[PDB]
Design a protein around this ligand. Structure first.
Ligand SMILES: [Mg+2]
Ligand SMILES: [Mg+2]
Ligand SMILES: [Mg+2]
Ligand SMILES: [Mg+2]
Ligand SMILES: [Mg+2]
Ligand SMILES: [Mg+2]
Ligand SMILES: [Mg+2]
Ligand SMILES: [Mg+2]
Ligand SMILES: [Mg+2]
Ligand SMILES: [Mg+2]
Ligand SMILES: [Mg+2]
Ligand SMILES: [Mg+2]
Ligand SMILES: [Mg+2]
Ligand SMILES: [Mg+2]
Ligand SMILES: [Mg+2]
Ligand SMILES: [Mg+2]
Ligand SMILES: [Mg+2]
Ligand SMILES: [Mg+2]
Ligand code: NA
Lengths: 50, 123, 159, 53, 51, 110, 118, 203
RNA sequence: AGACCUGAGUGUGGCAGGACUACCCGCCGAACUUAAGCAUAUUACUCAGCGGAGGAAAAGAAAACAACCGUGAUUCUCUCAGUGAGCGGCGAGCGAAGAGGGAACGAACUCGUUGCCGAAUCGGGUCUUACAAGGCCUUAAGUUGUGGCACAAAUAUCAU
RNA sequence: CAGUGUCAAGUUGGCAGGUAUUUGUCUGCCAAAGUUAAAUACAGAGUAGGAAGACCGAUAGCGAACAAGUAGCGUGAGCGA
RNA sequence: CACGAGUUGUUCGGAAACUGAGCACAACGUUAUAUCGUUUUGUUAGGAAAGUGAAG
RNA sequence: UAUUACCGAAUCUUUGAACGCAAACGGCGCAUGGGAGAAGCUGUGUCAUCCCCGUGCAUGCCAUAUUCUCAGUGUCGA
């Protein structure tokens, strides 16, 4: 609901900023192994519980 | 791109003026970063940031050297701020110095003088 | 405060209990007039101070500088003997003409045996009221005991 | 000396239709409930481990 | 065995006095100099009940 | 490399007939050889003040060891300028060598 | 110290010497003419921000999230020669602080935006 | 000198006058705190024997400890396992009360180094010791060749590691030769020496 | 009036509490197991628990061995020795020391006490290129004793 | 060795000489204060460097040759590809 | 699933600023061991826990 | 050199033994230096309330006071 402390809000904001796909040019680098993020999180699959 | 040999000759007032000019430049480039912008313009951000770093480096080195020379006087030596002393380690700061060690009693000194260690050889 | 209460109750307890003679003898002190007279004598034979010792030694040094020969006579002026170790030595070697002991030394075992030693060696002695008064006479804060071994020709009758 | 034994594994006992070998605890991974500690288990300890003496 | 209830009550726990609505303890006044040598006069102000 | 040590007898009735090196020379042996113990400590001689001499022959052996050693010592001068009393000249300092034997018995023998 | 009129002894009042100001333990050179650049980071050019410039005389900025309204007003006065009559702030779900700033109608927010370059 | 008289007098703790003096002191001690700082030692001759000097960096404290046997701290006095380990009230601590007093002082005041201690008084409930400590940051201590060994960090918590005189006493290090062979240089060192299995390369 | 003793408040200069913990030092301390049962015994003066250091720690300079033609601080190694020692429901089991060959080794010193001196000592200012193991000044500490000299490896105190 | 009770002697003395006591001899040593390098440990430590192996070879070898104490699980202590 | 956006306060809720069932820092005591106990029945601690207006 | 390697000069957000007081609060103080500052006072200055920044401020213990201020039916003394 409405209430949360600011520190909790900032932790949730960092997770929101992290939840993104790999930019395409990263796959073109010499000797690259990254294909997908593999740390993607969906709100309805795994809980953070902050 | 400010040059370090050029910065080392300036005074404090001039260095601060340069700092203000470069901060204003970087601030103006942030607006371009927001509103589209050309790649040549965006290429200027890194050199300006590094110039700001250089100016602050020169300022701080000069200030610390001046304060160390100022507190080097014997009267003020006991009141040097802790951030301007030598660091070493906690243990080494607390340990006995060479002068405090090696102290000996009158009898020990006299006996060392009366029977010194010799150099000899056996035929 | 607790320390006030305890330092009063200690005096009361020392009064109410049965006190053996070796400790009881320290409550029987010399009178006022003789106490004042003895303290005056000790005051006039007080030991020399730091400045006086320095000045005398410097004058002896200049005398020796001008005369590389000749004796120097670094004996220091006649005075009273002060300090527990030196006073005990004077009592035991029977050099002391008279011994004065303070009656309130804590711990009391420091001087508890001194009247017995003086009686054994037949040395005149007295027990007087304050180690602070003895210390004032000799120029310090406190003295436990003082011994007179010799005086000038003018004070023989007083002694 | 520790290889193959770094688990808090316990046997499930009889009365379930599984072999009585000790099994990994917990959940949420593909290793949970797997066989453990035995010389015949994947990830187990070898028979008569070698020594420097 | 297990602990008997009469022994358990000595730990305190959920068996202590329900005192939140009570007024203070009930006592006479202090035996002071006025009570030892003369007398004191008070006035009854209220009569009440406590749980 | 190793300091000079005395010869002693082994104890008990099983090792009575053997000999070995002890800890240090006794002050009685050192006095019979004419040596201040404190000075002997500085020219590579071991000193042991605990050991007693209960017989003459055991003392004589060690006095002879000390004398043989002292006859072969080559003492270097403190100051190269001035040589005082029994100290080596510069020829011996030139022809000085090191005894690296396992027991330090080169010039007294086993 | 002569006659006490209370049933318990309390501590007496004695002379207290004030403490001395030591030489500062921080000797880093900090310029006082560049703080406004830390306070005000850059403007925003979204649709809502553009709509506010013309019809409400308002500008939208990203600011340092530890700054307050009074210092945002002073920074506006320093950086641009404009007077703000109202500052409203919010902290966005991505963690940055945003400010809606209304000018005093003696200045044109559109002309200030043109000078800024947005 | 006077040391002989003081030492001989303190060898007569059961005489009438000594009993009176000790009774007064015991009464006053038992109305003070568990740890008390003193200006001067109560027994100067003993303190100087044990290493105290009337110098700037030396300090003396008096510590109180409680008498009697150790009680095993088990819930409701209930033990488990073999009957050999079932005593509650009849076992004794393997450390002595002097070492306990030193350890309490040293744990309380971490800026000091404990040197030694001695017995001062006794009573039916309590025993009292005096503990000598030095300041390792005092210039007088640091420049004095007879004492500045204690500045080195290998001497930080001697009393906690059992290196003082009382600790040596309960470690058994007063004895040598055939009376102490199984505890030298320590019990654990001797046990390791006698129990480790040895594998020579060719065997 | 003041002084000493015992306690406080504040200013000035410092130090402790945390981490790490393989090895090392001090406490506290099991049971499974073995005995074809089990309670003494064993596992074990071990695991778990609490505390404390270092580059190693601890030990160390004879209130030591022996009973010899005598050795000579400590630590470590081989051996003594799974012992014709010894402990043990004398069962299961347990269990060392002296001597001998070696590694290391410039290995030794300091207080207190006794005798002779008795502030000669310490801190703090200040000046010498110097918070000098130096001068000068200091009541501040200290005589309820700081410091010097001699004492078994010694021959004696001073005296330039 | 620890707790409590009891509590010395004066180098004509004291302690040790592996069966208790009393009495004479003999031998070694001098407790109840302190400092001290090396030879020894590192049986789940660490810093800066080095050298190897009749070892394992991707279900093996450290749990981990990969963004591995990660993803994921548990209220939690913890568990863990 | 991808890209781009959105949460505006002198007065609304909280805090600043109450007290309750309760908690437990200091102090003191205990323990080989603080990682233990006491701490609102007007109330800490053998307990010297007050640092101020006003005058001048 | 936006190249690499090494190192002596520097920078080093919020915390944490965490130590001004607290804390599911990016909170609230006391001293002492600064900054900005419409209002008012005089376009300069100057500036109340409000706002911002630096430094010090835990407990215990040791030493110390150009010899700081005290307390006691403790012991004396004028
Ligand atoms: Mg929620
Ligand atoms: Mg494996
Ligand atoms: Mg109640
Ligand atoms: Mg051995
Ligand atoms: Mg610690
Ligand atoms: Mg087993
Ligand atoms: Mg069976
Ligand atoms: Mg055993
Ligand atoms: Mg353990
Ligand atoms: Mg050591
Ligand atoms: Mg002396
Ligand atoms: Mg030692
Ligand atoms: Mg694998
Ligand atoms: Mg989505
Ligand atoms: Mg808002
Ligand atoms: Mg309440
Ligand atoms: Mg309260
Ligand atoms: Mg805090
Ligand atoms: Na069995």
């Amino acid at each position: 609901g409405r209430f949360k402390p600011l520190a909790v809000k900032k932790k949730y904001a960092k997770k929101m900023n992290q939840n993104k796909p790999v930019p395409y040019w990263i796959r073109l680098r010499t000797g690259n192994r990254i294909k997908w993020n593999e740390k993607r999180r969906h709100w309805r699959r795994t809980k953070l519980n902050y | 791109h400010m040059k370090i040999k050029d910065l080392r000759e300036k005074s404090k007032d001039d260095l601060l003026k340069t700092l203000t000019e470069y901060k204003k430049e970087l601030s103006q480039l942030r607006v371009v970063q927001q509103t589209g912008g050309a790649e040549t313009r965006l290429g200027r951000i890194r050199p300006i940031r590094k110039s700001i770093a250089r100016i602050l480096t020169v300022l701080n080195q000069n200030e610390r050297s001046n304060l160390k020379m100022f507190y080097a006087d014997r009267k003020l030596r006991c009141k040097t701020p802790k951030v301007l002393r030598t660091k070493l380690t906690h243990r080494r700061r607390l340990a006995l110095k060479e002068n405090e060690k090696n102290r000996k009693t009158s009898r020990q000194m006299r006996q060392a003088h009366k029977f010194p260690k010799r150099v000899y050889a056996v035929k | 405060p607790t320390f006030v209460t305890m330092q009063r109750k200690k005096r009361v307890l020392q009064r109410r209990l049965k006190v053996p003679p070796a400790l009881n003898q320290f409550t029987k002190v010399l009178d006022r007039a003789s106490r004042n007279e003895a303290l005056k004598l000790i005051k006039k034979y007080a030991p020399e101070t730091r400045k006086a010792r320095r000045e005398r030694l410097q004058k002896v040094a200049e005398e020796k500088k001008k005369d590389p020969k000749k004796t120097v006579s670094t004996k220091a002026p006649l005075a009273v003997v002060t300090g527990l170790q030196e006073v005990t030595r004077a009592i035991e070697k029977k050099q002391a003409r008279m011994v004065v002991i303070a009656n309130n030394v804590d711990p009391v075992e420091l001087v508890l045996w001194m009247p017995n030693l003086c009686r054994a060696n037949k040395i005149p002695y007295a027990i007087v009221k304050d180690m602070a008064r003895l210390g004032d006479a000799i120029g310090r804060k406190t003295a436990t005991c003082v011994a007179l071994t010799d005086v000038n020709a003018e004070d023989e009758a007083t002694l | 000396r520790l290889s193959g034994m770094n688990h808090s594994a316990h046997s499930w006992g009889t009365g379930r239709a599984v072999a009585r070998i000790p099994r990994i605890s917990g959940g949420g991974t593909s290793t949970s409930g797997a066989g453990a500690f035995g010389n015949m288990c994947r990830g187990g300890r070898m028979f008569a481990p070698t020594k420097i003496f | 065995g297990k602990t008997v209830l009469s022994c358990r009550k000595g730990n305190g726990s959920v068996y202590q006095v329900h005192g939140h609505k009570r007024l203070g303890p009930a006592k006479l006044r202090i035996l002071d100099y006025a009570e030892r040598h003369g007398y004191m006069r008070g006035v009854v102000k209220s009569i009440e009940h406590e749980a | 490399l190793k300091a000079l040590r005395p010869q002693v007898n082994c104890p008990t009735v099983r090792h009575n007939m053997k000999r070995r090196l002890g800890r240090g020379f006794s002050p009685a042996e050192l006095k019979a050889a004419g040596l201040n113990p404190q000075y002997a400590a500085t020219i590579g001689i071991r000193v042991d003040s605990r050991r007693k001499n209960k017989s003459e022959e055991g003392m004589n052996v060690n006095v002879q060891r000390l004398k043989t050693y002292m006859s072969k010592l080559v003492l270097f001068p403190m100051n190269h300028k001035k040589v005082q009393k029994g100290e080596a000249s510069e020829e011996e300092v030139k022809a000085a060598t090191q005894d690296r034997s396992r027991f330090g018995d080169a010039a007294v023998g086993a | 110290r002569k006659s006490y009129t209370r049933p318990q002894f309390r501590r007496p009042h004695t002379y207290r010497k004030p403490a001395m100001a030591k030489p500062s333990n921080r000797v880093t050179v900090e310029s006082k003419d560049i703080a406004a650049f830390n306070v005000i980071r850059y403007p925003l050019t979204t649709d809502k921000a553009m709509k506010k410039i013309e019809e409400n005389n308002t500008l939208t900025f990203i600011v340092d999230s530890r700054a307050n309204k009074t210092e945002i007003k002073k920074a506006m006065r320093k950086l641009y020669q404009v007077k703000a009559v109202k500052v409203n702030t919010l902290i966005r779900p991505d963690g940055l602080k945003k400010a809606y700033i209304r000018l005093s109608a003696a200045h044109d927010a559109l002309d200030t935006a043109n000078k800024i370059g947005l | 000198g006077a040391f002989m008289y003081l030492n001989e007098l303190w060898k007569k703790k059961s005489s009438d006058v000594m009993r009176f003096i000790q009774r007064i002191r015991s009464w006053e001690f038992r109305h003070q705190h568990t740890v008390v700082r003193l200006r001067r030692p109560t027994r100067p001759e003993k303190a100087r024997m044990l290493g105290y000097k009337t110098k700037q960096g030396f300090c003396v404290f008096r510590v109180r400890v409680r008498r009697g046997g150790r009680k095993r701290p088990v819930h409701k006095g209930i033990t488990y396992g073999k009957p050999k380990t079932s005593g509650v009230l009849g076992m004794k601590l393997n450390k002595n009360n002097q070492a306990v007093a030193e350890q309490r002082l040293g744990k309380r005041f971490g800026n000091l180094r404990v040197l030694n201690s001695y017995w001062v008084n006794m009573d039916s409930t309590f025993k009292w010791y005096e503990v000598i400590a030095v300041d390792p940051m005092c210039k007088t201590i640091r420049r004095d060749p007879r004492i500045n060994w204690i500045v080195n960090s290998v001497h930080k918590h001697r009393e906690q590691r059992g290196l003082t005189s009382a600790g040596r006493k309960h470690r058994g290090l007063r004895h040598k030769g055939h009376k102490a062979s199984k505890l030298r240089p320590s019990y654990r060192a001797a046990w390791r020496r006698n129990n480790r299995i040895v594998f020579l390369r060719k065997r």
